[PDB]
């Protein structure tokens, strides 16, 4: 977690939301539950499947015959064949292992970045109409109903619509 969102300022995930890698939990007078931000996790799914395809498809191996045989009178070239196979084994093992490790670290950092910039988008779209209570949660200064939820998640939240009402409860 280089960006510090997952296992950072958010203590942990939610186990009751199997509907998206990134979601919102909201409660108000007439609604409570877990729902996902469709666009962000859809883009994440597409990018990750492209990443996996990029990792796998770059195998372009033609028809090879690794098995070779040599009798006693040319043990030297048999040792050379063993040397070639051992070297190929070594380079493949080292490169593949470190590639897998680096790719896993980058994937975890990608998910961390998606959580972080989803939080960034929400706070930027919300400004000071809510207090940052912590743990990636927001406490609104005004009545924010279901269409207010849809305004926040869809991206069409309105600043001046609730500004006066928020200022009423802020003093």
């Amino acid at each position, epitope marked *: 977690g280089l960006f510090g969102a997952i296992a950072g300022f958010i203590e942990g995930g939610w186990t009751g939301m*199997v*509907d*998206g*890698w990134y979601g919102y939990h909201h409660q108000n007078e007439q609604g409570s539950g877990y729902a*996902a931000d*469709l*666009k962000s*996790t*859809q*883009n994440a*799914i*597409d990018k*990750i*499947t492209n990443k*996996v*395809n990029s990792v*796998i*498809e770059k195998m372009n191996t033609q028809f090879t015959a690794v098995g070779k045989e040599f009798n006693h009178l040319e043990k030297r070239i048999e040792n050379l064949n063993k040397k070639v196979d051992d070297g190929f084994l070594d380079i493949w093992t080292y490169n593949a292992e470190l590639l897998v490790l680096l790719e896993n670290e980058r994937t975890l950092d990608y998910h961390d970045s998606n959580v972080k910039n989803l939080y960034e988008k929400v706070r930027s779209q919300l400004k000071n109409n809510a207090k940052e209570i912590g743990n990636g949660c927001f406490e609104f200064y005004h009545k924010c109903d279901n269409t207010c939820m849809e305004s926040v998640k869809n991206g069409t939240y309105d600043y001046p619509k609730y500004s006066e009402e928020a200022k009423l409860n802020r003093e």
Partner: antibody
Amino acid sequence: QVQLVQSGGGVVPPGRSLRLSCAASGFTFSTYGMHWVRQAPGKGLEWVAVISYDGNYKYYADSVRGRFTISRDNSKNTLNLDMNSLRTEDTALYYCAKDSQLRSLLYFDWLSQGYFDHWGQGTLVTVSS
Amino acid sequence: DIVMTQSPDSLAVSLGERATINCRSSQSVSSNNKNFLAWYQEKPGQPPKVLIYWASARESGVPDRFSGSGSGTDFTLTISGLQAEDVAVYYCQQHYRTPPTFGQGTKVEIK
């Protein structure tokens, strides 16, 4: 060349099971997810079920949820659908399709699946007495 | 699911003219320049083969005279120089959510 040959359909009365199979050939199978789609007589096509490349995740249409059991196998490259608690509405013409996105990952029940590349020859199923 | 229907249906034109089929979706389908729609064509007794994938490209094998374009929520199939053996049924398709809701169906027939 892609080929999706399928057979096993026929006449059946309501209330008993039915087995369908759609063999695939001419292309690598275990990397492409496959799809099910049906043609009600005098109607349009509609969605049935999907299964991923690895067969780990299995998604269903809203209409036939809990009654259709999708599975695949990669040893013999066959997409098969199981039939539980049929009704007369299930009479249609079954088509086995192939998804387009290579190694498409389906980890949530609404994700953007690819379009249909290639379609099967069709098998006839009737639910009548 | 994303309900999706096309307005013109059972259109009948003779040979050589144009036949347009616009198709509407209740919710935005394309995003990030990714137009998620396909058109499918079948003749009676024939499997539905793909006609236009991605709503702008061409699957190799279909005649060049078949073309389509559009973005957002309006997506059109245009046939120029319609030829006799191209009478068939055309289906819309949105592969944006996991349930692919096809259009109720439009049909072309010679005049």
